[PDB]
Amino acid sequence: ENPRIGRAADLYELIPEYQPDTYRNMDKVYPTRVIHKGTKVRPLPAGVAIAPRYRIGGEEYGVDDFMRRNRVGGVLVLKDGKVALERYGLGNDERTRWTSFSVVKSISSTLVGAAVQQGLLALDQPVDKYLPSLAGSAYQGVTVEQVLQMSSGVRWNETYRDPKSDRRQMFDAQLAERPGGILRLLASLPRQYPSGTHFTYSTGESHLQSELLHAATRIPVSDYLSERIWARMGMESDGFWQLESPAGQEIGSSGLSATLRDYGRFGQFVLEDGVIDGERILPEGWVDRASRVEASSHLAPGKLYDGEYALGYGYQWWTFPVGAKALPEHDGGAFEAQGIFGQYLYINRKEKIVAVVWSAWPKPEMDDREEETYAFLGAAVKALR
Amino acid sequence: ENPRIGRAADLYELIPEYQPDTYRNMDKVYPTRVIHKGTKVRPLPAGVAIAPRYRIGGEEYGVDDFMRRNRVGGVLVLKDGKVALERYGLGNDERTRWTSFSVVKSISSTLVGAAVQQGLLALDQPVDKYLPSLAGSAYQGVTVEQVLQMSSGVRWNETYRDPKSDRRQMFDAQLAERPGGILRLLASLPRQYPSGTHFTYSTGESHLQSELLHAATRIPVSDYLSERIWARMGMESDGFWQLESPAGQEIGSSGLSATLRDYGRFGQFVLEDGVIDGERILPEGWVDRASRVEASSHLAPGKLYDGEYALGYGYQWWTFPVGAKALPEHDGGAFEAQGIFGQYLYINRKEKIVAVVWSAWPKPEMDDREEETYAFLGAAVKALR
Amino acid sequence: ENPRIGRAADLYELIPEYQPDTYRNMDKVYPTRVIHKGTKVRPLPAGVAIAPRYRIGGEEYGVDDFMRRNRVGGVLVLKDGKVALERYGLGNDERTRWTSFSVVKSISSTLVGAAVQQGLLALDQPVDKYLPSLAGSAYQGVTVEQVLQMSSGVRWNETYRDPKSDRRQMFDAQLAERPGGILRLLASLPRQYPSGTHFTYSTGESHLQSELLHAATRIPVSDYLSERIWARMGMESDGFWQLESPAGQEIGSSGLSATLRDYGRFGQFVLEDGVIDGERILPEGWVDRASRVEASSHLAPGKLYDGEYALGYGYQWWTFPVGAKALPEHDGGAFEAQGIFGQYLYINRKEKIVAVVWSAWPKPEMDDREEETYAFLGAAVKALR
Ligand SMILES: *C(=O)[C@@H]([C@@H]1NC(C(=O)O)=C(S[C@@H]2CN[C@H](C(=O)N(C)C)C2)[C@@H]1C)[C@@H](C)O
Ligand SMILES: *C(=O)[C@@H]([C@@H]1NC(C(=O)O)=C(S[C@@H]2CN[C@H](C(=O)N(C)C)C2)[C@@H]1C)[C@@H](C)O
Ligand SMILES: *C(=O)[C@@H]([C@@H]1NC(C(=O)O)=C(S[C@@H]2CN[C@H](C(=O)N(C)C)C2)[C@@H]1C)[C@@H](C)O
Ligand SMILES: [Mg+2]
Ligand SMILES: [Mg+2]
Ligand SMILES: [Mg+2]
Ligand SMILES: [Zn+2]
Ligand SMILES: [Zn+2]
Ligand SMILES: [Zn+2]
Ligand SMILES: [Zn+2]
Incomplete structure (x- = not known):
C-alpha cells in the first residue's frame, strides 16, 4: 500500500489511518536536520526474560493485549542496560524512526x-x-x-482548540517557515506571574531550550546532540529533527525521530548519569536536580494542575510521586518524558530500568490509556525485581 | 539540451521556448503531491483511425497542420472508449505528464x-x-x-495583468507558500451581488472545492482522487497535483499533471456516468446536472459575458449550445473542461466521444486558436460518424 | 565524514569549523538553480610551475605559508591561459564547488x-x-x-551588525523566501544623492543586476549564464546559483558556486575580451569601460571611502591604482572581483594573468590578510614576468 501521509498543518488532527505513516515519515512533511550517528555502536545485549501481565477492571492482560488496546507501535524495556522486552506494532520495525x-x-x-x-x-x-x-x-x-x-x-x-492561543500562533509560525518566528512570538508575550513562582506548561518556553543551545554552542542543535551523545555513546541509526524552517532551527519542544533502540540508548545514557566511557557529559548531580521532588516546591508531585495530576516536574521531566503517594511499583524517584498520542520514555534509577513506549492514540490525551501504560510498566518493573 | 524551466513566479508569462518544458516539469517548480495509480489499468484499445480535415479561411487542414498552427503538444480522440487518434508534439511522448x-x-x-x-x-x-x-x-x-x-x-x-487583482493576490499567496493564504484572501472579499444570481469566473472560488473536499474527507485530496478514480478504474501512470505549500493543500483550480491517456481515462469515466466496474462513484444524474443547459438560467450558453461567449457553465464545466445555436458538429449536449494556453477535455455523450488537447499557445487566451480547436474537434466528430 | 553545515541564517557568522563545509555545500542550505555546462570543455593546459615567494615582516613566505596563514582553500594562477599554479586546501579538491x-x-x-x-x-x-x-x-x-x-x-x-540596516532586511527577505521581497525593499528606499554622482556600496543594488537580466531576457539568469558562457566556453562542471526562493530569482550579489578551474575559465573569458570561439559575447570595449580608471571620476582609485581605500570601482569590479600610486607588480590596469572571508578573482590583462583565491578567514574583512593576498599575487606576477 501507498503511505498515508497527512498535510503538514494537520499533524494534531490526523485520522487514525494517517497517524502511523506520518509519525514515521516526518522528514517527508517538515524540514529536518540529520542527527548523525558515529562508527561505534553501544551494544544492547539480550537480558532478563519477562512476560509481564497486569490487571485492569477485573481482567488480566499481557503484552499483545496492551499493544492492541492502546494502539502501541513500539515497546522497549531495558534492565541493567540489557533488552528485557522489544516489540513493534502498526507496521513498525527495528529500522523505523518514529x-x-x-x-x-x-x-x-x-x-x-x-x-x-x-x-x-x-x-x-x-x-x-x-x-x-x-x-x-x-x-x-x-x-x-x-x-x-x-x-x-x-x-x-x-489551548490548541482556541484559534487565538499562543500554541496555535506558534504552530502557524512553524508552518510559515520564517526563521526566528517563534522567538518573535515569545518576545511579544506579556508577563503574568513573578518569575520562578508558577508552573505554566509552555511549548514555546520549551522551544527556547533549542534556541539557547544554538546560541551558546554556535552549531546546529542536531550536531551538538550528535557530538555529545548520538555519535559518542554510539547510536545504531541516524536520527533527525524537525526545524522551524529549511536548514533552520530545531524545534526544542517536538519533532525528533529515532529508532526504538536509540530512544532506549538515550534513556540508558540518563540512567548512567551522563557518563560515556569514563567521561562525564552531564554535571555531577544533574540527573538528581533534573528529576528532583521537593515537598515545598511548586513543582512537587500532586501540586500541578489544581492538584489532580499525580506527577510533578523537574528539568522538562515529569516526576513520579514518592512515599505514601507513589503509584504502585513506581516508587523511589521514577521520572519520564512524555508526548501526546501516547509517547513515553520512562527512567527508574532505583531499578536500573529504561522503558520506551510509542503509540498512536486517536486523541492527544486519554487518561485511561495513560493509566493503563503505567499499570503495564509497573507490572514489568515488578517482574524485573 | 537540458530542460528550459521557468521561475515559479513566471508561469503565466513564460516565453515560448520555456513553455513546453515547464508545463511537463511542474513538480520541479512547485510543491506537489503524488496521485497514486493502482495496479490494474483500464484498457484503451485502438479503434478505427481517423485523419480528419477541416476548412479555415479558404484553406483545408489536416491534424498535422492543426498541431502546427495551434502549437499542440498532444491530441487524443476516443470513440466509445477506443483510441481513434493519438498524436504527440513539442517533444512530448506517451509518458509525458502535462x-x-x-x-x-x-x-x-x-x-x-x-x-x-x-x-x-x-x-x-x-x-x-x-x-x-x-x-x-x-x-x-x-x-x-x-x-x-x-x-x-x-x-x-x-484579470491577471493587473498587479492588485484578486487572481494575482492568490498567485502571490501560492508563491509565498503559507498554509491557508488562499482562504484568508477569500475571506477578505466583499459581496457584490446576491448569491445565485450572477456568474463571475473566479479561480479562488474554484479552489474552494479542494478545501471543501479535504474538510469533508479529512484526507489529502490527491488521495481521495486516487481511491475514488485514479486507482479504481486504474490510470496507467501516477499523476501529481500542485500544492499551496510543501505537503499542503491541492490547488482546486489549477495545477494537476497526468499523461495524455490518463486525462482520456478521466473523460471516459465521466462519459460512462461515473460508474467503474459496476460501482457507482457519481450520483445518478450528476453528469446531467453538472452539464445542465436551462434557457432560463443566468448560466445558459449565450448569456455569459453579457452575450459575447457562446458557452454556458455547469458544475465547473463549460457547456456547448444546444438546439439551433449549436456549433457545427457539437450538438447534443457536449461540454468541456478548458485551461489557458489551449488545454481541453471535451466530452460528447451523444457521440460517445472523449477528446484531450494539450497546447502551448503564446498567450493564455487567443480567440482564433480556440475557434480553430472547435473546428478541428468538429471535423473529428464528423470523421467518426 | 558528515559535513559541518551551518544554519541558513548564520552564513555571515559561522564558527571556523563550519565555514569550509558550508561554503562548498550551499545547495544543501539555500534554494538554488543549476548552471549547466555544455558538451565540450575548454582545456586549461599545464604551464611552467611557479613557486612565488614574498617577504612579510622580515620573513620569506611561499605558497604553502600563504595558504596556512590565511586559511586559503584554493589558489589558481593562469598565465596566457595555462596553469602556472594550482593548489587546494581545507579539504577541497578539483571537484569542489565553492x-x-x-x-x-x-x-x-x-x-x-x-x-x-x-x-x-x-x-x-x-x-x-x-x-x-x-x-x-x-x-x-x-x-x-x-x-x-x-x-x-x-x-x-x-551595516551587517546593525539589526535595522537595509542589508539585514535584504537577508531577512531572502530567509523568508518570498518572491520579489528584495525588489519590494528596494522600491521602499528613499533618494539621497543625485543619480550617478556618489558611490554607495549596496548589496541590494548589486542584486538589482539579476532582476534586470531576468526582465530583459525573460529566462532564469542561471540559464543565460549557461548559454552565453558556461555551456559555450566549455566549463568543466555544472555550477549553481543561490536563489531568493525555491525555483525563484538568482541573488545577483552573492551565492554562486563553481569549481576552482571554472572560476579560472570565467576569468579567462574576461581576459580574452569576452569572445568564445570567435563568437563575441561582450561588446567591443566592454572590459575597458567596466574597469575604467579616470582621475576625474568619483569612482577613481583613492577616492572611495574618504580616500581610505587604494582601489577604485568600475562596473561591479574593483580597480587597482595606476601611475605613481600603483601597488607593486599591480600597475597597468589590474582589476578584481572580491568576496568577504577572502574570495578573489584577479585579472591583469597586461600580464595576461588570471588568479583565483578561495579563503575562509575567521572575519568577513581583515585588512591584514587582504594586503598579504595582494603581496602574494604580486609575487606571482613578478615570477611570471
Ligand atoms: C507534547 O507532546 C505537546 C504538549 N504536551 C502536552 C502534555 O503534557 O500532554 C500538552 S499540554 C496538556 C495539558 N494537560 C495535559 C497533560 O499535562 N497531560 C495529559 C499530562 C496535556 C501539549 C500538547 C507539544 C508537542 O505541544
Ligand atoms: C485556467 O486555465 C485559468 C483561468 N481560466 C480562464 C479561462 O480559460 O476561461 C481564465 S480568464 C478568462 C475568463 N473567461 C475567458 C474565456 O472564456 N476563455 C479563455 C475561453 C478567459 C483564467 C486565467 C486559471 C489557472 O486561472
Ligand atoms: C560581498 O562579499 C558582500 C559585500 N562585499 C563587501 C566588500 O566589498 O568587502 C561588503 S561591504 C564593505 C564596506 N567597505 C568595505 C571595504 O572594501 N573596505 C573597508 C576596504 C566593503 C559586503 C558585505 C556581500 C555578500 O554582501
Ligand atoms: Mg529476551
Ligand atoms: Mg444518492
Ligand atoms: Mg574553444
Ligand atoms: Zn549557527
Ligand atoms: Zn454559517
Ligand atoms: Zn487533513
Ligand atoms: Zn521568467
Missing part, C-alpha cells in the same frame, strides 16, 4: 545539561544574555533554570 | 460529486459549515452548489 | 554586458523601463550604468 512529540523536551534539557558541563550555559544566567532578541521582552531576566522548570511567569495560552 | 491549468476545475467538481455520493457533502449546505475559516466573510451562507456554479456573488477581479 | 560571495557581482555585471551586446539592455536606459514595479521609487530614472557603478544615489545602509 516522532517524539514532547518527549524531545527532555532531550533538549539533557543537552542544556551537557552545555552546563562545558561551561557554555549556566543555570543562573538570564536568557537574554544568550538571546539578545529577547531584550526588552518579558523573557528578559528569566533564567535558564526557570525556563527548564516551565516557571518563567510569562503569560502563555496553550 | 499540467492542466483550469482543466482541473472539472476534476475537482467531479470529486465533489463523489463526495456527494458518499454522504460527505451536500449541494444545499453552506460552505462555511465545512470551512470555518469562511465564517464571517461574504462566503458565509453561500452553498456548495453556488460555488460549483461560480455564482457566489462575491466580488472577484480575475 | 561559494563566491560578492565575487558574483562581477559575473552579474558581465552578463549585463552580454545583454547589452544582444540589444536587450542599454546602459543609458532607466531601470524602471525594465522593472515597472520600480516606477515611483528612488530608482526611477536611475540608469543601468549607474547601478553597475554602485552610483544610483539611493540611500542604503550596508
